[PDB]
Amino acid sequence: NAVTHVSANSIRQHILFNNFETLHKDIQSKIDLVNTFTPQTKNLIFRNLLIVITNSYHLQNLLDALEQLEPMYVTDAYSEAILNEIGLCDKGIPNLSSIHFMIYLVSGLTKLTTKQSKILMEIVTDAKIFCHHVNVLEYIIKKNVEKLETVTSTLLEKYTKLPLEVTLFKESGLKIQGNTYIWDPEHKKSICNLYTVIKIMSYIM
Question: Where is the signal peptide (predicted)?
Answer without folding.
Answer: none
